[PDB]
């Protein structure tokens, strides 16, 4: 964003150069899900089913005990960063199966 302060030490220290906005590259969309891959994954999801711990997540969420849902999801997957979003995804599956 805006350039350095020009003063060698302190908040936003450094030497002043007129900063520049980088053109969009490939790999800034890296991971942006696409129409067909979403189609594929969603189709295969119910055909395969749900893994047993994911079913336990569904059960704990439909009880509403989100802390233990996250806890067991973390103990299965391994890290909080992915446990959190696995809980989000399974909460999404429960809203999309209590929508109807």
């Amino acid at each position: 964003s805006q350039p350095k302060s020009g003063l060698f030490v302190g908040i936003n220290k450094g030497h002043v150069v007129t900063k520049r906005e980088l053109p969009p590259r490939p790999s800034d969309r890296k991971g942006k899900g696409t129409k067909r891959v979403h189609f594929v994954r969603n189709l295969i999801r119910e055909v395969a089913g749900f893994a047993p711990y994911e079913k336990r997540i569904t059960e704990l969420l439909k009880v509403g005990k989100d802390k233990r849902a996250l806890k067991v999801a973390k103990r299965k997957l391994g890290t909080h960063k992915r446990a959190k979003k696995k809980r989000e995804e399974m909460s999404s599956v429960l809203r999309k199966m209590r929508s109807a």
Binding site: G10, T18, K19, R20
Partner: protein
């Protein structure tokens, strides 16, 4: 151990006599590299002997941030704005580094002047004999072409030592530069403690 001497750090408890590397072949590598350079020059005649063009870039690392050096290649932005296609730039003696990022106009125009200079004093033989297509060069000046030797576009490593003479103004004398220089250090120390009280100022009031 005995009388006052440094605590030894001899790292010679392994079998170092199996891994001594002697440099008696130093003149030999000098001469072999020289021979290789002659036989590359004759082959790439009449290309420049230093190779393709290299960008002026800054070094990393606070110790050398101000000292410019030759980089690896021009970025895509730079090639595009100097009007030279991606796949053609390495062809005519211009390196390309798709991994660099241009973060400054100061860097971009600095290298764009180099691209323009290289295209200014570049000559390109036709791919065939009589057919002179677009981007080629005329025979009359093709006929004096030579192999430049050494660095054909030198890079100054630091900006020149220049000390002009100027007035000492009253408001320049009043400037407490050390007080200034302590104030932002104080702000950097207190940056968290300030923004926290701001955060709960919003959260409550």
């Amino acid at each position: 151990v005995k009388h006052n001497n440094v605590i030894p750090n001899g790292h010679f408890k392994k079998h170092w006599q199996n891994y001594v590397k002697t440099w008696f072949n130093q003149p030999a590598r000098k001469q072999r590299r020289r021979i290789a350079r002659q036989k590359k020059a004759v082959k790439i005649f009449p290309r420049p002997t230093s190779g393709p063009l290299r960008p002026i870039v800054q070094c990393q690392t606070r110790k050398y941030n101000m000292k410019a050096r030759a980089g690896r290649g021009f970025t895509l932005e730079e090639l595009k704005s100097a009007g030279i296609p991606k796949k053609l730039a390495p062809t005519i003696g211009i390196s390309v580094d798709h991994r660099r990022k241009n973060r400054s106009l100061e860097g971009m125009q600095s290298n764009i002047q180099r691209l323009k200079t290289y295209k200014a004093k570049l000559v390109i033989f036709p791919r065939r004999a009589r057919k002179v297509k677009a981007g080629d060069s005329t025979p009359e000046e093709l006929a004096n072409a030579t192999q430049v030797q050494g660095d054909y576009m030198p890079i100054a490593r630091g900006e020149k030592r220049s000390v002009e003479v100027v007035k000492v103004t009253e408001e320049m004398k009043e400037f407490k530069a050390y007080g200034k220089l302590r104030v932002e250090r104080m702000n950097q120390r207190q940056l968290g403690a300030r923004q926290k009280k701001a955060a709960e100022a919003e959260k409550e009031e």
